[PDB]
């Protein structure tokens, strides 16, 4: 019965969320800037 | 029967009734019979035509610029140039066959195919 | 229970499967062949006879199997093999 | 234990396949992109100098 | 014993239960992606030979930008561009670390793995799917609002078939979630089964399966990301 | 009770008989009709002739389905081996 | 010991499920394929639609009508099961 | 006691599952091919975007009507099991 | 003693299994055919990437709606079996 | 119940499945092969003689399976493995 | 032991679900591959343009199949009503 | 009821399913590959040779699955797992 | 009626269903992809080398499903869940 939704559902989200922030600042914006510069 | 009217650019090459027509379209070999559905077709660069007529040996024609159109009444082959078999010379056709010139190679191959040597 | 009843039920279900599969296959294959024939007739009416003969062989390849399955009806429903 | 050894052998095969038939083309593509961008940079610089 | 599932190192806090193994896998994946982000940041280059990590990141961004612009111009919903990427790579890493040889026996014939793909867990896939669900629903609200977005979605492309449209809307997130679960759980179960064979028999089938799993994971990540952008575009029009 | 089991198996078999017959008839009809419709669209006046083979095609497939109907007389009305 | 009628009706309903499953598969496939044909025809000939419906119905007719055949047997296989005790 | 109600209910539920399996297959395939035709016509004849929806809607209606008939008769089989003693 | 609960549950989940089998077949086939049409249109029309989506996604919605209705009915059959006892 | 009774019932059912699968496959595979043949004939009648040779082969592959499939059914119904 | 009966039925149901999903995936993948191959044969230049929609369609069909995969767990490992 | 009897009956039903599905798959794949081959031949008579080596591959893979199913006959009816 | 015997019989029935469906899907998809490949090579002889690039991808999915089912088949025959 492991397929029942678990509190882990919430926890993982936060992880993902914080990761997004990095890709929102230090991954995608620099790449867009360098591509536009090229 | 169906009327084949082979019309070359510089001159109406031939016209007459016949029973069956065989041609090499881009999609593939095509046979045309009296009441064939109307259509339009390219003929391959190395195309060829074979007309089977009533009481006469089938005529084999090499064609460059072959461009077929079947109507409700007659079939017309608009052609840049065409050669009947009884006028082509094998040595010239083979000499110019498979040349680096795509047009020359295609025309020579069509000539050889009309001759039947393939 | 009486084993003959179980064997009869099993044979009934087996024959049902046999003929039903045969029927599905025959119907679908005949539809495909008829589509081919209809398209060909639309394409070139003068090939009528030339078109009729190949189609029949196709039908022969299909119907026969169906009939073969139908044949096994006798070997299943009536001549119940293994009946004790 | 035995499962571990078999899995290690399997992963070794994975690595061998990757290096033999995956690393070469991908490395070639990366080097191609690097050379293309360097060529663009040098072309811009020499155009400005010209 | 096959021993399917049975999360290991599970605990509970504030009445909510959490799986230690799944959280560990998610944390490791986040660490890898953040390390790649720092590598890019410390090796950014606009006037020199770019790094391999730079090549990878720029190709990822370029392709996602291409699909976004084909669907919706960036000027309308730029936020789709980051989201997309932070999904794709995430899933990819989630499905790639599984290749590493971290399989050790459970002392009872139930082979165990120190690392397991988080997408093999309903929690991770549900989190991702519901996150994207709320994301593009909120985007649709923002473009139109709570008054126009509902009438638009219920009407859909054709309003007279509304119930079908509502079924679309409700079932989108479901499939988006458990497609991940299926893709990765198949691989997990298959590797567990292959663990039955001895080493001299288990080496080859595991090798073939993992070789194929690389492609499976890459393809699945790409399709999930692209489908996310597609839903975003379908939630922002007219 | 042998009658119970025999009658059960017979009804399951007959239901499958009709299910398969219906599948075959439906597919054959669908593809044959699609061919006919495409032919008509290409040539509106060809109907006069295209209907001829189509009636055969349909008659060649539906008959099979109708043949299957016969086994209803053999599977729910007169079950062989009934006890 | 169990009453014959119970197992007989269970088998009858299983058979009816088979009948409807097959009939629905056939009807859906036939309708979809005939549709596809008609839509393609009108797409390549928007004017011809006025006549193009004449054969399509026939096709779907012999499909859809065929479906009713199976439908009837539901009663026979549910309402009045042959061999019911 | 073998509970004949239980046996007949299980048979009825299996029958209903068959109803829905066949209906789902038929409707899915019919919709898939109807779509295929619609997309092909739109790609080849974009101007007919507002016109092809008539017969496409018709074919979808036929297939979904078969599907809903299956739904209704499955509900009859399952929710109100006929033949219960 | 053969528990009626167990027989009922086994029949219910068998029925649900057929639900899902039919639904998966239908959905997969429909999506495949619609995708074939979409790819063919894309090849024939290079720039119709966003233009061919509307009918394609209409039909995808139809097939998925059928499949997910089957999902819901299977969930009802299994988790809350009708006439359970 | 007699072990042979259950064994033979299962054998009948299995053989019915064999026939169903074989009939489906053979019938509609041969149908599509015949469709290809008929379309080719319609497009270009003179190739008849030259196009049977491949067609035959296809049928041989479609029939073979079914035929060999049929063989197994016979065993199931005449030499049932594990017939206690 | 009713547990055995329910387990056997649940296994059969899960197997049927897997079969249905297998047909779904196989046919969908084959159809998508056929479409892509035909398009590519008709033009090489736009290989990626064809790859994209092919990948979406593959994702859709595989989703249809992996729904069934996922319900494997509910049907074999965690059987509702197992008692 | 003999447990061996039930086990063998289930194994034999399973093998019936195996072979039915394998026969269907092999037949349809063979038919489709042959349809493609016949169309190609009708479109390019000279291409025959260059069409066999690809087609072969296809049909081989088409036949591939079938043989695996065949193999499992030995596993089911001849070497039934779980036999007691 | 030994519970283990009944559950194992159901397990073999399952395995049969899974493998039948897997063979169906694999055969049909492989045949479809092979027909596409055969046609493509027929239209233009010398792009066959390119044709394998997409075609293979297709089987890489299609064939995979087979193996997936294969794996589950084993899980049913040798690792019957809930054997108790």
Residue numbers in the entry:
A (entry chain b): 23 to 60
B (entry chain H): 3 to 120
C (entry chain T), J (entry chain L), L (entry chain M), M (entry chain N): 3 to 86
D (entry chain d): 1 to 50
E (entry chain a): 10 to 247
F (entry chain S), K (entry chain O): 4 to 86
G (entry chain R), H (entry chain Q), I (entry chain P): 2 to 86
Any passages from the paper?
The membrane domain of the mycobacterial ATP synthase is embedded in the IPM, with the catalytic F1-domain of the enzyme extending into the bacterial cytoplasm and attached to the membrane domain by a central stalk and a peripheral stalk (PS). The mycobacterial rotor consists of a membrane-bound ring of nine c-subunits, attached to an elongated central stalk, made of single copies of the γ- and ε-subunits. The mycobacterial PS is made of two proteins, bδ and b′.
Extensive classification of the data for the mycobacterial ATP synthase revealed the presence of not only the three main states referred to as S1, S2, and S3 but also of substates within them. Substates S1a to S1e are in S1, and S3a to S3c are in S3. Further round from S1b by ca. 2° lie S1c to S1e, which have similar c-ring positions to each other, but there are large differences in the F1 domain and in the PS. The positions of the top of the PS suggest that the order of procession is S1a > S1b > S1e > S1d > S1c. During rotation through S1 in either direction, the γ-subunit approaches very close to the PS at b′Arg72, and potentially a salt bridge could form between this residue and either γAsp170 or γAsp171. Unlike the tether, which can be formed in any of S1 to S3, this feature can form only in S1, when, during rotation, the γ-subunit comes sufficiently close to the PS for a salt bridge to form.
